[PDB]
Amino acid sequence: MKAKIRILDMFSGRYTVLINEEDAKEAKLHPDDLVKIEAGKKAVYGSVALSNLVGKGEVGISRDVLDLHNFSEGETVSVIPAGTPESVRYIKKKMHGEKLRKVEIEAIVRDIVDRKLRDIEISSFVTALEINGLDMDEIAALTIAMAETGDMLDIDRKPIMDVHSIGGVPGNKTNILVVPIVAAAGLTIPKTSSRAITSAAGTADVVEVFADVSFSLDEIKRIVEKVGACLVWGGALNLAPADDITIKAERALSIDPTGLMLASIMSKKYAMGSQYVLIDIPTGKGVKVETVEEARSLARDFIELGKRLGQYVEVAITYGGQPIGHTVGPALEAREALSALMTGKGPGSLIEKATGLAGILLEMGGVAPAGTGKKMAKEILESGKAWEKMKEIIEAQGGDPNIKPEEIPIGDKTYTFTAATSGYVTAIDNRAITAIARAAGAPEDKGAGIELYVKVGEKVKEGDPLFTIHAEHEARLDQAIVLARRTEPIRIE
Amino acid sequence: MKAKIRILDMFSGRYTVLINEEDAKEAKLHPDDLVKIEAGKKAVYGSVALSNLVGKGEVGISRDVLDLHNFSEGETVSVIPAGTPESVRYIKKKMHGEKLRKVEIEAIVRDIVDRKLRDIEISSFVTALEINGLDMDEIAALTIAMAETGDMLDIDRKPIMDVHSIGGVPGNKTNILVVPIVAAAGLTIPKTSSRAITSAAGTADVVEVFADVSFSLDEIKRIVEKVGACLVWGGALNLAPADDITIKAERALSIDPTGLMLASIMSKKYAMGSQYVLIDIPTGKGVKVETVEEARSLARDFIELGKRLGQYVEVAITYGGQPIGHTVGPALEAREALSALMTGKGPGSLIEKATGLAGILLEMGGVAPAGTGKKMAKEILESGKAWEKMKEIIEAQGGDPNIKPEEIPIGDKTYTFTAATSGYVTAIDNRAITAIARAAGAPEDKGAGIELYVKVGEKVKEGDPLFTIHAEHEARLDQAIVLARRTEPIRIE
């Protein structure tokens, strides 16, 4: 069937195609059906929705489609029904515990990217993986395939370094400190973090506060070529398109298969050509990886995955028991990260890790002799050499290099919690702290967040103030105070 | 977040809720997020889509919502973000192979019915079941749970007799024959079949040809009380709502868990109060249950699940390699079924199968002494008692009891295939035959269908006509013809 394309001012989270009830009847189309719309070489797969808003002869396509495909309104396109994808058979084999040929895996991924496979197919694929699992040969094929289906950036500078944190730890703004520090060494390190969805803040969310996160792949390359490093948001560029789609499925079912995760993390690195990668695995209660033993295995998996991909990889296992620094939430986190870079003096938890992680990278780069990596990082930070590099990144990013950290604005409405009884602080719960911060409105409101005046092992006396809640809106503050009250995140004994 | 409901003329195949870009930002709502909309007692769960269509201060709900919920346009409603359902935790357990507690099973079903669990979650439950299976204890719990959350009809006449064929066989118009015959005996048998989704025709489609198929539960009870039987569509009433929602995922994945299938089939019967259910398992090549050994196993399961539900279940394994009778398609099937009832004579496959199934029900009903049911069924059919009874159903369903079968319309455009060679017919492919019928336009076009002038084992000299294609549009028929030529549904050797 041929109909003229009509743009729709709507975002459904899916490629939505609207078809006339009468016109649809001719094609035998039904709601939620998959139809392939094509004009020239380019074609797109959409999920049918029947509405009378669109007249006979017109096809309605939502704006979601416009981002990756260029279709001009009033354009004539051919809309034809789509058969069930061939890849589904492959999903089934995995479902049955069978190993997957590289060819079978590639087809599944390509469909995921082209959108022939929707939520149902993907949730099933993700579910199958969790129950049955992926062996190492499969993971690598999956990793390479995920990278291949998406845009890849080629950069002249070498060696290229990357740093990653599996996460699950609040206020981990350490990467912001590490990249500036490493670049000063003159190594090239282009970081691409992502905005927070299930967390109070994201590296990208923190960066937006003092700079502009979004950039073109080409623009990203130019910045890296001159600055030597960048701190841009991952979502805008087309890297590992498959990884993000699968994640929606993982977040909903609250399950993260290790094979998919290893593959997903490395897929982005391989695409950008990172040659040396450092992965930080925060191990501890209330963190994604609970024990050292689990981390130790995960580290081995990451290193081996690198060998298959041609990447030299090293992993660091770090504590994830307590939030890093005393600041949680994007506005608060940016001030803390930046003040530390400028001052050269910062919270010990944030400072030691950044230098230490950075140190591992410096040695890998070849810049520093083995065992002196942590120390070299300390000198760069103290020198203020690190701060200048950050200024360069900020200037390149369009941020104001002349900005002052004290100047950044925290939330106007705040409530502070004080200790119920005298004691020593045995533990701090990440989920509760992040949950409270999120209630406070992070990361939608940069101002909102939490500030901790205490750290684990710290002695406390009655009336001492454990943490303060910052909220942009008073209505938000009550919800945060209430959630915080039930949780009693800080424990004293 | 108070808002005035606005109804949008669109069918998304999902409970779509449209929100303003400005309004959504304030509420931290994103595309495809789950939201709970409630007024007074009424509440509904929908997926947020960001739109311009709806002005600020308004929320848009598609027509799908209107079906089960009385929401009036301009109605003032409150909109809050829905959290992840507690049930997903349970889905995970099944994911890990754990047996499911009844409360846990019950929770998943209620959530599935309530629409809290969308496409991603349901697929996982379904994927997990196929991958890990369902225990017999769970199936009864699932089956009862499904029945419990939907409308149930308590019919006064007892005992209540039901007949069901897992089908997969082309041209199965047998049930139409079974119900009238059984009804004549004075037994009560209320059948609610469903329109074809992947078949050329459905019992529901055939019935619509000579009588209205859509009816209310209250309307439905009344006919049975007086008529003693009915042939109405399953879809119109809200019975076992979960079966349909889950079914879409299975069809999409082209899988059918045994535990899920039994619960789905059995759930409807439990709801209607059927006390004596007869299951017909068509075993043969190209039929759902391919082997007799597989079919027998299925039969043991249906009976055991019956005991658990307090129902006397009996299974009859029949042959399904060739299409029943000589007609495929709704217009064609109705004429054949009706002609046989009026005449008391018709094709052997339909009459023998129909009488035998009917006989088992009669024996079950106490109406006949053991071993005498088929003979009695033939007498009722031969007597014409059956045909008289059909007219009572046809009348009450709103059709002319005076309709002359021969009169019923068939497609104007037809093509006939003849024997390429001489020999004996070794086999017929239902999948091929059904595919051709569908291409012709079945079941949307009643006229479309196929007519077989041959049965397996018949000897045909070269040039003998094999089957005839009926279509209501030349375009459809030609497409079918090509398919038919490509297919070669009849094998002679």
PDB file of C-alpha atoms in Angstrom, chain A residues 9-14 26 49-53 92 95-96 119-120 123-124 127-128 131 252-255 476, chain B residues 9-11 14 26 31-32 49-52 88 92 95 119-120 123-124 127 130-132 249 253-255 476:
ATOM      1  CA  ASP A   9       3.367  15.316  17.269  1.00  0.00           C
ATOM      2  CA  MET A  10       3.654  12.386  19.651  1.00  0.00           C
ATOM      3  CA  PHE A  11       6.240  10.293  21.513  1.00  0.00           C
ATOM      4  CA  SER A  12       5.024   6.785  22.325  1.00  0.00           C
ATOM      5  CA  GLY A  13       8.339   5.214  23.314  1.00  0.00           C
ATOM      6  CA  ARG A  14       7.924   3.047  20.246  1.00  0.00           C
ATOM      7  CA  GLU A  26      -8.007  -3.207   2.927  1.00  0.00           C
ATOM      8  CA  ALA A  49      -2.181   1.950  15.593  1.00  0.00           C
ATOM      9  CA  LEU A  50      -5.509   2.589  13.914  1.00  0.00           C
ATOM     10  CA  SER A  51      -6.963   6.068  14.127  1.00  0.00           C
ATOM     11  CA  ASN A  52      -9.347   8.152  12.054  1.00  0.00           C
ATOM     12  CA  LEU A  53      -7.253  11.229  12.753  1.00  0.00           C
ATOM     13  CA  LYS A  92      13.840 -19.964  20.920  1.00  0.00           C
ATOM     14  CA  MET A  95      15.212 -20.471  25.184  1.00  0.00           C
ATOM     15  CA  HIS A  96      15.872 -24.180  24.930  1.00  0.00           C
ATOM     16  CA  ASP A 119       9.259  -5.594  23.594  1.00  0.00           C
ATOM     17  CA  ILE A 120       7.875  -9.095  23.651  1.00  0.00           C
ATOM     18  CA  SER A 123      11.919  -9.447  27.062  1.00  0.00           C
ATOM     19  CA  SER A 124      11.857 -13.071  26.048  1.00  0.00           C
ATOM     20  CA  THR A 127      14.577 -13.653  30.084  1.00  0.00           C
ATOM     21  CA  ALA A 128      16.022 -16.589  28.213  1.00  0.00           C
ATOM     22  CA  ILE A 131      17.624 -18.412  32.970  1.00  0.00           C
ATOM     23  CA  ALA A 252      11.387  -3.685  34.218  1.00  0.00           C
ATOM     24  CA  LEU A 253      12.048  -7.303  35.240  1.00  0.00           C
ATOM     25  CA  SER A 254      14.728  -6.169  37.685  1.00  0.00           C
ATOM     26  CA  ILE A 255      17.194  -8.733  36.379  1.00  0.00           C
ATOM     27  CA  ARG A 476       8.725  17.445  47.212  1.00  0.00           C
TER      28      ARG A 476
ATOM     29  CA  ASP B   9     -10.425   8.613  18.235  1.00  0.00           C
ATOM     30  CA  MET B  10      -7.681   6.044  18.034  1.00  0.00           C
ATOM     31  CA  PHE B  11      -7.150   2.370  18.771  1.00  0.00           C
ATOM     32  CA  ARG B  14      -3.259  -0.827  24.508  1.00  0.00           C
ATOM     33  CA  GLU B  26       5.917  18.693  35.993  1.00  0.00           C
ATOM     34  CA  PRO B  31       6.734   8.030  27.208  1.00  0.00           C
ATOM     35  CA  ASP B  32       5.400   4.537  27.836  1.00  0.00           C
ATOM     36  CA  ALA B  49       2.500   8.822  25.462  1.00  0.00           C
ATOM     37  CA  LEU B  50       3.561  12.430  25.136  1.00  0.00           C
ATOM     38  CA  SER B  51       1.276  14.308  22.797  1.00  0.00           C
ATOM     39  CA  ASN B  52       0.331  17.754  21.556  1.00  0.00           C
ATOM     40  CA  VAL B  88       7.046  -8.993  39.085  1.00  0.00           C
ATOM     41  CA  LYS B  92      11.189 -13.714  38.839  1.00  0.00           C
ATOM     42  CA  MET B  95      12.123 -17.341  36.447  1.00  0.00           C
ATOM     43  CA  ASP B 119       3.991  -6.534  27.239  1.00  0.00           C
ATOM     44  CA  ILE B 120       7.437  -6.832  28.770  1.00  0.00           C
ATOM     45  CA  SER B 123       6.287 -12.180  27.895  1.00  0.00           C
ATOM     46  CA  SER B 124       8.710 -12.973  30.657  1.00  0.00           C
ATOM     47  CA  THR B 127       8.830 -17.235  28.419  1.00  0.00           C
ATOM     48  CA  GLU B 130       7.870 -22.474  28.533  1.00  0.00           C
ATOM     49  CA  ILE B 131      11.465 -22.585  29.709  1.00  0.00           C
ATOM     50  CA  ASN B 132      10.794 -23.871  33.252  1.00  0.00           C
ATOM     51  CA  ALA B 249       2.533 -13.074  23.576  1.00  0.00           C
ATOM     52  CA  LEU B 253       6.597 -16.021  20.041  1.00  0.00           C
ATOM     53  CA  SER B 254       4.967 -18.926  18.255  1.00  0.00           C
ATOM     54  CA  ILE B 255       5.077 -21.010  21.471  1.00  0.00           C
ATOM     55  CA  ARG B 476      -7.217 -11.777  -3.546  1.00  0.00           C
TER      56      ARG B 476
END
